[PDB]
């Protein structure tokens, strides 16, 4: 529910999966970075019945 929320589009980021690497002696760890996507949902249906 977004009753009272000021906005028409709502975003929910996606969370990816990380990698696992071998740790070698005298070698620094390997850093991982992932470019994530997102999900969006709009308010687009406005219906009415009147008499």
């Amino acid at each position: 529910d977004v009753t009272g929320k000021k906005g028409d589009r709502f975003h929910i980021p996606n969370i990816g999966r990380a990698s696992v690497f071998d740790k070698l002696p005298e070698t620094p760890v390997q850093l991982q970075a992932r470019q994530e996507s997102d999900f969006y949902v709009d308010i687009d249906k406005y219906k009415e019945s009147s008499f």
Binding site: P13, I15, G16, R17, A18, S19, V20
Partner: peptide, 19 residues
């Protein structure tokens, strides 16, 4: 606006268990 560190840490733990 999100806690990036917490998500990355949880995912690292999950990945280690998966491995």
């Amino acid at each position: 606006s999100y806690d990036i560190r917490q998500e990355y840490t949880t995912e690292a733990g999950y990945a280690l268990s998966r491995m």
